[PDB]
């Protein structure tokens, strides 16, 4: 096209972790996100 | 640290939990 050449990275990808103290206290659940950013979410 | 030298299609290093300043 123009040979701007790019550069190529593995698009963000990552495990899920759940935050949740038990079900006896609550049941309200929250995730994390770990090979990712909150841009990407 | 400094005399170390320094997402990879499926397999991944995590975080500490203890990152090198809380270390």
């Known amino acids: ?41 | 640290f400094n005399k170390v030298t320094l997402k990879f299609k499926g397999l991944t290093v995590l975080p500490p939990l203890l990152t090198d300043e809380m270390i």
């Open chain 1, 1 to 41: 096209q123009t040979l701007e050449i790019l550069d190529i990275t593995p698009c963000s990808f990552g495990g899920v972790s759940v935050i949740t103290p038990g079900t006896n206290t609550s049941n309200q659940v929250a995730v994390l996100y770990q090979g990712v950013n909150c841009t990407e979410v």
